[PDB]
Design a protein around this ligand. Sequence first.
Ligand SMILES: CCC[C@@H](C)[C@H]1CC[C@H]2[C@@H]3[C@H](O)C[C@@H]4C[C@H](O)CC[C@]4(C)[C@H]3C[C@H](O)[C@]12C
Ligand SMILES: [Mg+2]
Ligand SMILES: [Zn+2]
Ligand SMILES: [Zn+2]
Ligand SMILES: [Zn+2]
Lengths: 150, 765, 151, 67, 109, 183, 146, 43, 228
Amino acid sequence: RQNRRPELGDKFSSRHGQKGVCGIIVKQEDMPFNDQGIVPDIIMNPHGFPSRMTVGKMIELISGKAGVLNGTLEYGTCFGGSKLEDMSKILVDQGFNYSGKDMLYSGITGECLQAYIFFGPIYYQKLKHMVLDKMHARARGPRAVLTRQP
Amino acid sequence: DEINTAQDKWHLLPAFLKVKGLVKQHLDSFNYFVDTDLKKIIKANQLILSDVDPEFYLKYVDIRVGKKSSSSTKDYLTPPHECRLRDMTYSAPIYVDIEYTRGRNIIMHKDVEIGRMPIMLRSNKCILYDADESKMAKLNECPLDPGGYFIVNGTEKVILVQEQLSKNRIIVEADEKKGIVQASVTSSTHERKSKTYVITKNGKIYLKHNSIAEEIPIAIVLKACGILSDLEIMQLVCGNDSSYQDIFAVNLEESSKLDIYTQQQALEYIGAKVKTMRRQKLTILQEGIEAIATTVIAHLTVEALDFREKALYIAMMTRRVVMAMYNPKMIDDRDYVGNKRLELAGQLISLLFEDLFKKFNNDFKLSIDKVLKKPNRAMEYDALLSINVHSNNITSGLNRAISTGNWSLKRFKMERAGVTHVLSRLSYISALGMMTRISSQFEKSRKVSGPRALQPSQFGMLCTADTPEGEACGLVKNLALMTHITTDDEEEPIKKLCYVLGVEDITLIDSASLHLNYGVYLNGTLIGSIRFPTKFVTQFRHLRRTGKVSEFISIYSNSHQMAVHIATDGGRICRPLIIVSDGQSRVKDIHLRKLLDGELDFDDFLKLGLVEYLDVNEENDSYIALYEKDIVPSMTHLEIEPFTILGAVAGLIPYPHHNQSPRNTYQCAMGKQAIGAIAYNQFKRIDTLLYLMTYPQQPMVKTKTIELIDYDKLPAGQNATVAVMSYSGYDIEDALVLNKSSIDRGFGRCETRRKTTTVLKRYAN
Amino acid sequence: XXXXXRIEQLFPVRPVRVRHEDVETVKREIQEALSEKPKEAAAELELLNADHQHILRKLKKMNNKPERFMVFQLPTRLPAFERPLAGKVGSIRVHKSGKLSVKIGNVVMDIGKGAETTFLQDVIALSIADDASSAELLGRVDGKIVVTPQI
Amino acid sequence: MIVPVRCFSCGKVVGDKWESYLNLLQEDELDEGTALSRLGLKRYCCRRMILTHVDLIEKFLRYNPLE
Amino acid sequence: MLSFCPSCNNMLLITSGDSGVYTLACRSCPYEFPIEGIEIYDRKKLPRKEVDDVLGGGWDNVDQTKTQCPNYDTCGGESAYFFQLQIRSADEPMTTFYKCVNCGHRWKE
Amino acid sequence: IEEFPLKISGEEESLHVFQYANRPRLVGRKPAEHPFISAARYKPKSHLWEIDIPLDEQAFYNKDKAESEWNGVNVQTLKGVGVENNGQYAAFVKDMQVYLVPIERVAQLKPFFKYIDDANVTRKQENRLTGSLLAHKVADEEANIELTWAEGTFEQFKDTIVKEAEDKTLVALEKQEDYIDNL
Amino acid sequence: VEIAYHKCDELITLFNKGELETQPGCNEEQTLEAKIGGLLSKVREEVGDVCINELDNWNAPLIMATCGSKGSTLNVSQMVAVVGQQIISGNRVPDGFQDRSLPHFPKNSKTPQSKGFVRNSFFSGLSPPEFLFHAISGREGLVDTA
Amino acid sequence: KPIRGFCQRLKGKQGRFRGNLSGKRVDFSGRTVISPDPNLSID
Amino acid sequence: LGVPRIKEIINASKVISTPIINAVLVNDNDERAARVVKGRVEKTLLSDVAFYVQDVYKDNLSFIQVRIDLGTIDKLQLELTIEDIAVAITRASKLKIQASDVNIIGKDRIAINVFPSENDVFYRMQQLRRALPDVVVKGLPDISRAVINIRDDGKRELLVEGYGLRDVMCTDGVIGSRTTTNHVLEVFSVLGIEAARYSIIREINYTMSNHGMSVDPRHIQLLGDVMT
Ligand SMILES: CCC[C@@H](C)[C@H]1CC[C@H]2[C@@H]3[C@H](O)C[C@@H]4C[C@H](O)CC[C@]4(C)[C@H]3C[C@H](O)[C@]12C
Ligand SMILES: [Mg+2]
Ligand SMILES: [Zn+2]
Ligand SMILES: [Zn+2]
Ligand SMILES: [Zn+2]
């Protein structure tokens, strides 16, 4: 057995085809925080959404936030599932913006961010491709007996 | 609150899945094999004789698997996990009853073992059949394992479902700059043959085969089959249509240009051209060799004087070629889902066991003959010792074939590479996706997009997203959630029902008024004609819905080639649907409350005729409502729940109808590389490579499918707190930013597990 | 449609040559032209009614004629009766409001017309005896009646 | 397998509330949300750390080799 | 000619027999027909043709969007035809081809 | 309203139904004709019928090539295998009642050219056998029973039919649902 | 949209009862298709333009499309307003059944919403048939490039 | 006919010319996943 | 116009799919200015003007009669009345069976005589009846069809789909110095090698310009120079 820490280069995905490689690992204090001090685990570029047209991801984030607050798991099924208006009502009954956008502070400068930020839980998954199993390098060594090439 | 049919209709899907698991093609086929096909093969190759010793014979009376007498559930088997650990093979013994004699003419019997048969996981023979939570634990088996695979030499292998083009069905395909060539591959029990029906030139149509020499005119074969009137041909393959008569009558005179013909002369012309008999009994080489060469031209068997059925078969093939000559777009598409059949694991294992049994019988007979070559003391006693020593070849060959996947046979001379595949253990969903997966047929033709495109006809029968991209896109397919593959039921008992219902025998009607009526077909062979085809089909569907005939027998109509078709073979994908009568659904809500209470386990719905199965072809007659609020008073069916368009791996996406389709396909592809829990006994297991998650979490946004496939019990993922934002510039294009101190607290923490095997073997020294 | 160009019984035989666009339409006329006796549900109901009145007229027409014969297609294994086949098996009764039906004794069926046959048909008795083999001629077959059970 | 000691986002110790959550659910029947709020779990990250939990260890322990 | 022999229905032919007679032979049974006093002929109707029409093209009723031509300084294009019918890979997004409704410059994005 | 009691009659009859693939019916409003025939032939164990129809010489005969190729052709020969079909019943109306008699077999008669085959068998001259080959060998080896026609002697069958139908009166025991199980 | 479906109904009923006027290059069967294949395109474009005009200041998809960094106004119109017509091999989706595209539509169907026209947006959620048509159209490019 | 003759040792995508002469395998090389770095200068 | 087109141009295939000839006209008028020159470049019009065909037998003569109606020629403005059809039929008879005699009586009611081994006359009569209405009576027997196109400038020009380049350049009513085809190999046979080089360069620039690919013209120039 071998125990593995999510090194820089490990691949993740979010059930909507938005697979990606971990690019940087930053300390907790250098992370935007809301009024309660919640710090995100993952930050994703908003530029992956408009050209790929994944708004099921957005509805998943809102439904997950509302479900966590309400204490119930939500259903996103094909041609059905939890309605967005219900989730918005549940999210506004608890003092959160109906659209899941929250006023966060910078962790590097401390001051408010000039744009509201889409904040909530998205179910991720770690993929079997790890940079540990891929990093290869050769200087010299074994050669084919026939051609005497590496 | 009351039961609302609009929302409580979907509860039929869990009821269906309870008694018809996702892994049920494999299980059902193997069950049927070990219950019926073994005995059928035994009855086929029963008595092995010898030329010498005229009072001597060997007979197999009965066969069994893992059972000697009628008690105690004999033959304690090594548990599957023990086989998995010890590199053995999960198998059970085959027993036979031997009928052998002596020079004193005595009848003796026994219970003789003739090898080991690999047993499929979770079948009637497997020990895990109907286990409890405790039993599975005692045998170190995870209750959530799918099943439907074999352990051979310590490896888990599965036979994938194989796509095929349907057999015994006329397929008319046109072509440009050439004309029309239509074929019909007829595979009988021991010989298979394609009777190609081509167009050479001049607008005349010939017949082709690998056992005939060159270019038989169709008028000549029709005269050889009893249609010698030379005008009966016209009314047969053209009806009364002038546009067909002139385009066909080019070759109506090729049967007189050589000379005038009678039946015997035409048979002589054909028989001069057949190839050989592989150097055996060449004394038949005359006109009389056509009495068998016309018998061996199609799967239609003629065993008497009259040739009417095969004659009219070739006449209908001629009619289809003439129509396609008149205009294209009368041809059919070979990528249509209703032109393809599915063959399961038991069907292949039947062929493999038949071939091995025949080789074993041949070698047993040669051994007996060699022992009898001595001219003295022919002692038939202890002849079963030779069978007990020699029988290991069948077991060795069975294991070799079912663990290599290379199926090379001799009865059909069929040779295929890559039948079985090693079960994938990378996640809970990876194995479940390995099941219910279908590999494409032959004539791959990767350069063309024909067998690559999605088909509208695969709605609710094959998953619309599960597809591996890369280079096998559209070739590998997966089943939908609510499917059911048919079993070959019968051909004969329902033909009498046809004739009772009103169709006239094919041996009563005339070629003149043949095409003025609707003609019924049974498995693609013309049976007669009927007036009021609508009344015929309505009565037939009522008789099938009330349970008088099989529940998987499909009947429909076709107004282009005026006909009603009836299919009874196996390999046809079905799916349940709700019948709607007079603009009213047949559920009535009360049935749904009764189902919820505990009664009506989805079998009583078919029994009472509230729901029924449909293949692709009967869906053409169907006119189905999506939701209950779309029911116009001209509809035929209503679907039970419209999210089963997707399969099992596709059932993990939340809100799939809000993304673009390539995103759903990408998720289907890479949901199987997610690392998490695998099984409840993943720590008792020892595999080549495992990936495990320390702290897996249930998803916050579920789907109705993950509950049905128990993904919320073995999940592979974690709910991260996410901020969609541009941060640090290290997230530019599909690159993520991970929180240190979320990793420290343990988030995305995994474990790898490999194994090394060593063997200390013995040498001849 | 069109037609490419003891005396009249021996003129050369020409096929029926109807235009491709017309064959569907005339096909509903050819059926009523092969007898010449001396929205797919409404059409079939009308055909059933027309065949009913036709077969009633034929039943009236063949009141007593030596050379006229008819062929009935019945369901194989009709309801076996109790020994008190041979004898009387129900009745073919004309229904009310211009309808026709056949009764076997417990089961009622639908009686219709078969396909139209453009040839001669003869009924013949045969004997295998070696002292004399005969082929007695009785009559010529008029038409075909197909009987189908109904609830 | 077992409930994580801390929370991935905050760091608030939730390892001592799994048993209390189960007891509140079973005895003194309560809504899941009200049970989480009676346990002092107010932030949604800490709430999800206990709501989205599968106790796999109880299923791994049926296969102990020292029975 | 397509006529059939009565009482055998096989086929009728014209024979280069004796004494220069083109009578209607059978070749299957002894049946003959004297042509003398002729009226036989075979009429085959033939659709002639229609006056065909032009193919100017219908750029009207074609998909239109609101973009800017690359060579704006030459032609002022505020609209363009398009189709979203090019998809390289599934992970990668779709591709849209354009053409300038003003000048007719095709390009893709 | 009006009731036609249809009866059932004697089944100990070898009724056969002939069908001619050449001769049509109803050349006009008139129901055609029945041709003059003679010299019928049969073949038990193969049911191979053979019928002879004599041709006419005064109209369309071609005596020259007729005799030159084939020694004599003044009769038409029709072959045909008589197949057994189930459910057929012949009906003739004797009283207002209908009378049903089963058809043992039905044969479809097609033209038979023996003279051409004889021409080959005279000119070209100058082991278990399972299946249709055995049937062909039986049919062409054990052959040629001989028959006599009876054109209009129908004066010994109807009486029996009207008697064999007026001999029993039965009652049914199968129900309406029961028949659905039967058929 | 209901305006453009009534005109399509008129064209269908004309082509059915009588002989619709035939465009030069194409036949009577193709004239109808080539007409409605612009009668729907015009409404798709106008709805898209309306939504783009109503788009807010500080709307991130609009800023990205205006910037040229990611996406386009076509993409955001599909997300917000409507993704109109799914075409494969050059035109609307060919039949997969006898005179039909799916068994949920009446036989002999040529109306929009029966041959690959989606009036829903990704925000709204595709129906089962629109889902399937979009699936086929997406699979086309995948099976082409390889 | 799967035997490897002299001709078969020179042809195809993986023969001498297209596998070992015009295209080889080289020493001093490596391969691993890539990640971004803004503070890394281009070049 | 995709990679199959680039592949054809690059391979220099002698036979391509969809070859198109661009013929520049002299006048601009839809009626009797474009049709009069389109009618000279078309396919087998014998069955297009025959309006029926007859098979006639007699006591000693066997006839095949065609009644070529003149109204259709009066509508489709064609230059052929009687003897052009007769000469075409005799050329076809030389091509297929035999040239003996062709009779013309009135309204182009042509007759054809046959005589020559048994049934040979009947077989030949059947073959003639089947294969008669399939011989070109005007135009080029190497060209599928032509359609008149309305240009963006308003001009009315027709472009031809086939392999008859030199004949089209020679036909009356077209400008022979302005007439081009798809086939670079055709341009090579009739016009020369420099013309083929120009054709290669233009065809590549078109096939890669219609797809939105922006390639410098000098790369394509070098490709053409090397190819030729
Ligand atoms: C309708 C099918 C006809 C087709 C088989 C014939 C008809 C015209 C022929 C071409 C021309 O002669 C001009 C060229 C001459 C060169 O030497 C070889 C190429 C070249 C394109 C020819 C090829 C071929 O021979 C063609 C296409
Ligand atoms: Mg990518
Ligand atoms: Zn927390
Ligand atoms: Zn004849
Ligand atoms: Zn421009």
